[PDB]
Scaffold this active site. Structure first.
Site, PDB file in Angstrom:
ATOM      1  N   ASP A 237      44.537  39.963  51.233  1.00  0.00           N
ATOM      2  CA  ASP A 237      44.161  39.089  50.224  1.00  0.00           C
ATOM      3  C   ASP A 237      45.085  37.614  50.002  1.00  0.00           C
ATOM      4  O   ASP A 237      46.166  37.745  49.352  1.00  0.00           O
ATOM      5  CB  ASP A 237      43.958  39.678  48.985  1.00  0.00           C
ATOM      6  CG  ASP A 237      43.309  39.096  47.972  1.00  0.00           C
ATOM      7  OD1 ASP A 237      43.229  37.869  47.963  1.00  0.00           O
ATOM      8  OD2 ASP A 237      42.827  39.443  46.793  1.00  0.00           O
ATOM      9  N   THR A 238      44.688  36.615  50.606  1.00  0.00           N
ATOM     10  CA  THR A 238      45.719  35.467  50.179  1.00  0.00           C
ATOM     11  C   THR A 238      45.758  34.935  49.096  1.00  0.00           C
ATOM     12  O   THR A 238      46.487  34.074  48.383  1.00  0.00           O
ATOM     13  CB  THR A 238      45.214  34.168  51.046  1.00  0.00           C
ATOM     14  OG1 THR A 238      43.567  33.721  50.850  1.00  0.00           O
ATOM     15  CG2 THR A 238      45.205  34.452  52.614  1.00  0.00           C
ATOM     16  N   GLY A 239      44.620  35.438  47.909  1.00  0.00           N
ATOM     17  CA  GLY A 239      44.666  35.069  46.735  1.00  0.00           C
ATOM     18  C   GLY A 239      45.583  35.926  45.579  1.00  0.00           C
ATOM     19  O   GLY A 239      45.534  35.649  44.384  1.00  0.00           O
TER      20      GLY A 239
HETATM   21  C1  LIG Z   1      48.857  36.403  39.661  1.00  0.00           C
HETATM   22  N1  LIG Z   1      47.628  37.156  39.931  1.00  0.00           N
HETATM   23  C2  LIG Z   1      47.322  37.359  41.067  1.00  0.00           C
HETATM   24  O1  LIG Z   1      47.664  36.766  42.210  1.00  0.00           O
HETATM   25  C3  LIG Z   1      46.128  38.285  41.442  1.00  0.00           C
HETATM   26  N2  LIG Z   1      45.120  37.631  42.294  1.00  0.00           N
HETATM   27  C4  LIG Z   1      44.013  37.703  42.074  1.00  0.00           C
HETATM   28  O2  LIG Z   1      43.393  38.653  41.303  1.00  0.00           O
HETATM   29  C5  LIG Z   1      43.106  37.277  42.921  1.00  0.00           C
HETATM   30  O3  LIG Z   1      42.119  36.293  42.187  1.00  0.00           O
HETATM   31  C6  LIG Z   1      42.481  35.026  42.169  1.00  0.00           C
HETATM   32  C7  LIG Z   1      43.473  34.636  40.986  1.00  0.00           C
HETATM   33  C8  LIG Z   1      44.740  34.100  41.356  1.00  0.00           C
HETATM   34  C9  LIG Z   1      45.725  34.045  40.236  1.00  0.00           C
HETATM   35  C10 LIG Z   1      45.686  34.276  39.075  1.00  0.00           C
HETATM   36  C11 LIG Z   1      44.450  35.059  38.728  1.00  0.00           C
HETATM   37  C12 LIG Z   1      43.451  35.251  39.636  1.00  0.00           C
HETATM   38  C13 LIG Z   1      42.146  37.960  44.054  1.00  0.00           C
HETATM   39  O4  LIG Z   1      42.103  37.424  45.397  1.00  0.00           O
HETATM   40  C14 LIG Z   1      40.816  38.228  43.528  1.00  0.00           C
HETATM   41  O5  LIG Z   1      40.187  37.108  44.151  1.00  0.00           O
HETATM   42  C15 LIG Z   1      40.038  39.436  44.144  1.00  0.00           C
HETATM   43  O6  LIG Z   1      40.940  40.587  43.890  1.00  0.00           O
HETATM   44  C16 LIG Z   1      40.887  41.712  44.885  1.00  0.00           C
HETATM   45  C17 LIG Z   1      39.412  42.555  45.040  1.00  0.00           C
HETATM   46  C18 LIG Z   1      38.631  42.492  45.760  1.00  0.00           C
HETATM   47  C19 LIG Z   1      37.404  43.288  45.803  1.00  0.00           C
HETATM   48  C20 LIG Z   1      37.084  43.817  44.670  1.00  0.00           C
HETATM   49  C21 LIG Z   1      37.996  44.029  43.286  1.00  0.00           C
HETATM   50  C22 LIG Z   1      39.312  43.191  43.790  1.00  0.00           C
HETATM   51  C23 LIG Z   1      39.020  39.489  43.435  1.00  0.00           C
HETATM   52  O7  LIG Z   1      38.843  39.755  42.140  1.00  0.00           O
HETATM   53  N3  LIG Z   1      37.792  39.467  44.216  1.00  0.00           N
HETATM   54  C24 LIG Z   1      36.423  39.536  43.526  1.00  0.00           C
HETATM   55  C25 LIG Z   1      35.626  38.249  43.451  1.00  0.00           C
HETATM   56  C26 LIG Z   1      36.479  37.073  43.084  1.00  0.00           C
HETATM   57  C27 LIG Z   1      35.465  35.594  42.856  1.00  0.00           C
HETATM   58  C28 LIG Z   1      34.045  36.007  43.264  1.00  0.00           C
HETATM   59  C29 LIG Z   1      33.399  37.041  43.339  1.00  0.00           C
HETATM   60  C30 LIG Z   1      34.322  38.354  43.514  1.00  0.00           C
HETATM   61  C31 LIG Z   1      33.740  39.639  44.003  1.00  0.00           C
HETATM   62  C32 LIG Z   1      35.163  40.388  44.349  1.00  0.00           C
HETATM   63  O8  LIG Z   1      35.614  39.923  45.789  1.00  0.00           O
HETATM   64  C33 LIG Z   1      46.842  39.677  41.716  1.00  0.00           C
HETATM   65  C34 LIG Z   1      45.827  40.454  42.883  1.00  0.00           C
HETATM   66  C35 LIG Z   1      48.461  40.060  41.630  1.00  0.00           C
END
Ligand SMILES: CNC(=O)[C@@H](NC(=O)[C@H](OCc1ccccc1)[C@H](O)[C@@H](O)[C@@H](OCc1ccccc1)C(=O)N[C@H]1c2ccccc2C[C@H]1O)C(C)C
Lengths: 99, 99
Positions: free
Chosen positions: A25-27
């Protein structure tokens, strides 16, 4: 290897003698795994994503094997719906985004 | 181009004639942008992330330029913490993960 994104980029990781499936996960700034036992002391932390924040336990200096590549770093353990390999470890295996 | 992950992979995107910063997120199935106005009708959708689910508005066939590359696809609008370019558009610009 080169990973296309038609499907979720899931890979097998080896941590603490256990084999698990995780998403590259690059995000994600950090690496967060589902509830499990790890050795050593840990400290509380709150991390936020889509949907809000969750409380996790932070373990430092954890060794993880990702596709044969050994990597060392902080690993967070908590109620995450999927195991996530974040940037702190992706950099260690030389992972890059290309287009 | 090649993007390392020592920092968040943020890029400039152009949508609705305006420039915005967004995160190239391989962990996101879809693309979600912060509240803004887009043309046409929208459909409802719920997406789940690390801390739970959120309600978003789904707009289809939206033109969006990512780092100079033009894409046309589905864009979700809602209470996301940051603008996210997900796999649905990453595949359109030919983005892959490499290590
Ligand atoms: C500072 N916080 C971070 O970096 C955090 N970083 C994040 O939470 C990232 O978000 C940006 C983000 C960046 C900074 C701050 C807040 C948010 C993730 O890459 C997020 O995108 C992705 O999380 C993994 C995941 C995959 C599948 C199911 C459940 C969870 C997720 O929630 N995916 C779902 C999603 C997103 C958009 C549209 C549709 C769907 C369906 C899923 O694929 C954490 C991990 C530390």
């Amino acid at each position: 290897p080169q990973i296309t994104l038609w499907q979720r980029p899931l890979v097998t990781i080896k941590i603490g003698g256990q084999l698990k499936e995780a998403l590259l996960d690059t995000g994600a700034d950090d690496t967060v795994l589902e509830e499990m036992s790890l050795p050593g002391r840990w400290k509380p932390k709150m991390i936020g994503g889509i949907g809000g924040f969750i409380k996790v336990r932070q373990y430092d200096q954890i060794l993880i094997e990702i596709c044969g590549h050994k990597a060392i770093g902080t690993v967070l353990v908590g109620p995450t719906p999927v195991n996530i390999i974040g940037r702190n470890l992706l950099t260690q295996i030389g992972c890059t985004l290309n287009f």
